[PDB]
RNA sequence: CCCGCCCCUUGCCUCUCGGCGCCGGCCCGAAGCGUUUACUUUGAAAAAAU
RNA sequence: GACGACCCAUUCGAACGUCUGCCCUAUCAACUUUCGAUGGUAGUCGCCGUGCCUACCAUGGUGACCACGGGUGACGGGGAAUCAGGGUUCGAUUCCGGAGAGGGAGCCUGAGAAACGGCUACCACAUCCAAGGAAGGCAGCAGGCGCGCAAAUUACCCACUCCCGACCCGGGGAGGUAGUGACGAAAAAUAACAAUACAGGACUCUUUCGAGGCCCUGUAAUUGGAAUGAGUCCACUUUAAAUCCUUUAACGAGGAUCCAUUGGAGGGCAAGUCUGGUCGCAGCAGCCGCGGUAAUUCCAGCUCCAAUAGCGUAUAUUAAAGUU
RNA sequence: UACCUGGUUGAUCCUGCCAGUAGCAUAUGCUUGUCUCAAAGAUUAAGCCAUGCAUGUCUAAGUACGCACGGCCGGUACAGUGAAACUGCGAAUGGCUCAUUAAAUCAGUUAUGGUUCCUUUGGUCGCCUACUUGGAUAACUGUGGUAAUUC
């Protein structure tokens, strides 16, 4: 609707290649906008382009009308896929892993401690 | 973790005499229950337990000094207490009725539109009514000095600007849909 | 459970003054062996996410580490709870920026930015001396050093300033009244003050006075005293509020007299 | 109710080594302690949470 | 640069030792000694100090200021509940220290263990078997049986917090998340405002009579306009993924439903000599007492009072107790 | 909130107990619309246990002739990735329970000049073979045994 983001807490990050801020947002209409929405938007506020922008938080207080996140913004592409913890990287898709999970992986571990020497047998039986 | 019990009860379970000043009391301000009456009595007799040590210790030691000075500073922030006083005598000079009247639905009935104090409570709870930006719910706030200045309808609502009720948006679609050819 | 050394450190029994929270879990990073008191150190961790917030996990910490920025005492450590105590400097060569450890006069770990022209030596206490075999005498140091071949003349509770890349000292004090003396140990703690007196008994302790220049006049064991430079003369760059350290109704007045707590 | 005075006043000396003095000579701080305790008053010293 | 190793220092500790501090019992007053009790001399052993152990020798040690013996529904402490002052009671349980993995004993490896998700044996249990043999220890997380007055899901996940490894990368029922949850704590919904209708009293006018008129009150009848979340529910958001919460569409209130109960009404002690039934029967009653034909106490209805999302009942314990 | 009230008598004043009163924590009854915080097989049987799971671990840098994959061109020590296996390190931390345990444990205070210490940090590191010495084990290959096992 209305849609104002503000700049707060500015800090050139060097040791990682970033730039961390808080993410200060107004809006009397619906607040709370898509996280997709904000980033274009701080995107043409330092002319990075949205594919280094990085936000999270996004709690709104009571009464709304406000609402305050974080947000980071890297320098190049490569420096956020290597940094960027794995479930970032993976809430807007370039990045996943393939978890089966954690009974498939621990029934697996126990069948395999009876056998010796062959690791992929207890794999192949399903 | 940590925890704590407000109220406390009264030592005699029946006394006609305490009986009538707990309900007129609560007759006064509007009040939901005697939780809410204790509650508040709490408060004040522990704000006189703290200062019945203060008293006694001679004048120039430190703890006197620099406690009395930021007890009497919160007692004056909130306004139960004149700066005409300030003295730790005048601490014991205060009463029940005091802090009744820095409660919010006091203040909206006093400074602000309603036709009774049960009305007050009302437009509170109903979130009609804010407090220099913020939309509140609690009748119960206490309401700093500087702020009973600030008590404003909400920004959105009814009252003041703002969209029309469902008992009136509804009412204004029956002169064409509810009554207006079906 | 006692059939070993314990590893797990818990929040609740951390050591007080790295300012900790409680409601994240119920670890907190435990200093690894190293050079300086367990109790005396804070971890490298601690510096760089609660307090500077660099990073905001300890992943992070762990990912700053790896790619060697951080510097201790001129060589290169790579530990997320590498023992940093007192009277050591951190430096960044990916800022340009050095820090130096010494006490707040509330008595925690403080940043204290300095020169790069500073951040070339320390000050270190020495505390034993201690002849090895043919003939050879020794310093022993808090920081845990051994620098042979000492000229003798220096004793015990005395002070060197030590060069990080060398070793073999640049200058000392030496122990005794009319010293500019900062406090390490004890419940006081970052006062600065001269020595002005001394007190000896045969053997269980014994007391060293200390007063100030404004007047006050305290005492603490001899073994919390350590030297920074001659009579009103700190050959370091101090922290302010200079160690002369007030009391809580004159700090309140402060702050509602600059009528001051954002700028 | 901190120096001293009547006889006492933080009881003495003895001195000697490392500072302060004044003009070789002389003066006064630190060194042994006031028969012993309790008592009282001040410091040091004390994990956090509560 | 990586790795390894010797010694010294340091760090993390560990182990012995000093002084002081402990619940009940005298229907427990003498105890301890070659099956070392106390001390001396030398040695053995042990990481080291030491009757720790051995030889020889001495004859001591402790006690009415409570030893020794017995008891404990006794793990210790940081603490917790109540309380004017002084106290009393509790502490299995998140921090710190200790002890133990069915009961006992022995031992390997290692810097570190008398280890039990290591080993060996006995005793007590219990399983498989082709009866020749083999294998086992939930006071780890879930779950089951049993015991009882009495206590939850065979859930999700290493994202956080930290730990472990040769290691930025792996792993962790530690730990984090959800479910069950009226132990307990904080917040506070169950209707607010006008019209008519009667009702009151200050007020005014009037000689009284009477009228006007104002302040409020309940109370009936309908209503009238207004308001809101409880819920239903697209969407954002939350997060490891999700729930919840906050944020937002559209629907969502006329008192009959989008229904507040728990106890009591003779005295203690706030509240009825109302009506019907029962008639020392049945029952009530912490206590004092009610019931034998007019029941203020029983069984019900009506009405009223207290507390209020809570209230009653049993038991431990403190205050009340200047009745320790 | 430094407090009392009913009951021995025909009546009164005492002594004294009983009952009433309030909090706290366990059980239990009846009732329950929304929100945040969260204790939970201790009391009795430190009784007994099906099943599943709760400790593993590799960098350029200890050891790659997996006949695995790959190559592009191979081998001069010789690649790149890499299951397996030897080797190194850890499993003595955590978690759980409260049975034993009355100068014991434990708490405050002190002592190792009576001692040990993986590890970290700092020093210590020159009285017919050396162009590098010796010979076996696993994975692997192939052949087996038991009713049955991580033999």
């Given at each position: 609707?209305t ?10 990050n ?28 701080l ?45 970032r ?38 | ?77 909130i ?45 509170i709870?109903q ?15 206490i ?18 600007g ?21 | ?10 929040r609740?029994?951390?050591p ?18 190293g ?21 905001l ?39 340009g ?54 000229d003798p003349?220096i ?5 060197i300033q ?15 009244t ?27 302790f ?39 350290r ?5 700090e ?11 700028g």
């Open positions: 609707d849609v104002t983001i503000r700049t707060r807490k500015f800090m050139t060097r040791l990682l290649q970033r730039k961390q801020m808080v993410i200060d947002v107004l809006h009397p209409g619906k607040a709370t906008v898509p996280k997709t929405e904000i980033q274009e938007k995107a043409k506020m330092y002319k990075t382009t949205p594919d280094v922008i990085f936000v999270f938080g996004f709690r709104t207080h009571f009464g709304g009308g406000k609402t305050t996140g974080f947000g980071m913004i890297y320098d190049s592409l490569d420096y956020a896929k290597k940094n960027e913890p794995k479930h990287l993976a809430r807007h898709g370039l990045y996943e892993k393939k978890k089966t999970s954690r009974k498939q992986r621990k029934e697996r571990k126990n069948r395999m401690k009876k056998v010796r020497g062959t690791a992929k047998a207890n794999v192949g039986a399903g | 973790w940590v925890c704590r019990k407000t109220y406390v009860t009264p030592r005699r379970p029946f006394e006609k005499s305490r009986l009538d000043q707990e309900l007129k009391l609560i007759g006064e301000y509007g009040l939901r229950n005697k939780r809410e009456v204790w509650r508040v009595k709490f408060t004040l007799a522990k704000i006189r337990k703290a200062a019945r040590e203060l008293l006694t210790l001679d004048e120039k030691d430190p703890r006197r000094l620099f406690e009395g000075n930021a007890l009497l500073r919160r007692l004056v922030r306004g139960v207490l004149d700066e005409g006083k300030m003295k730790l005598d005048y601490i014991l000079g205060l009463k029940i009725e005091d802090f009744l009247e820095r409660r919010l639905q006091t203040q909206v009935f006093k400074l602000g539109l309603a036709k009774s104090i049960h009305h007050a409570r009302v437009l709870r979130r009609h009514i804010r407090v220099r930006k913020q939309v509140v719910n609690i009748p119960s706030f309401v700093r000095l500087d702020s009973q200045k600030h008590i404003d309808f909400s920004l959105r609502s009814p009252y003041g703002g969209r029309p009720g469902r008992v009136k948006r509804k009412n204004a679609k029956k002169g064409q849909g509810g009554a207006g050819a079906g | 459970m006692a059939r070993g050394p314990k590893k797990h450190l818990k609740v029994a951390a007080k003054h790295w300012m900790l929270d409680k409601l994240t879990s119920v670890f907190a990073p435990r200093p690894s062996t050079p300086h008191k367990l109790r005396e150190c804070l971890p490298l961790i601690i510096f760089l996410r609660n307090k500077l917030k660099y990073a996990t300890g992943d992070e910490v762990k990912k700053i580490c790896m790619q060697r920025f951080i510097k201790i005492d001129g060589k290169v450590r790579a530990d997320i709870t590498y023992p940093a105590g007192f009277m050591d400097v951190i430096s960044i060569d990916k800022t920026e050095n820090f130096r450890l010494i006490y707040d006069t509330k008595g925690r770990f403080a940043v204290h930015r300095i020169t790069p022209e500073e951040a070339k030596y320390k000050l270190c206490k020495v505390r034993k001396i201690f002849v090895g075999t043919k003939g050879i005498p020794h310093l022993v140091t808090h920081d845990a050093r051994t620098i042979r071949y000492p003349l004793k015990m509770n005395d002070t030590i060069d990080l890349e060398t070793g073999k000292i640049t200058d000392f004090i030496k122990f005794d009319g010293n500019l003396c900062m406090v390490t140990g004890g419940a006081n703690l970052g006062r600065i003050g001269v020595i002005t007196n001394r007190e000896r008994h045969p053997g269980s014994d007391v060293v006075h200390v007063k100030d220049a404004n007047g006050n006049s305290f005492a603490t064991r001899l073994s919390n005293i350590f030297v920074i430079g001659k009579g009103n003369k700190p050959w370091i760059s101090l922290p302010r509020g200079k160690g002369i007030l009391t809580i109704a004159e309140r007045d402060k702050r509602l007299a600059a009528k001051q707590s954002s």
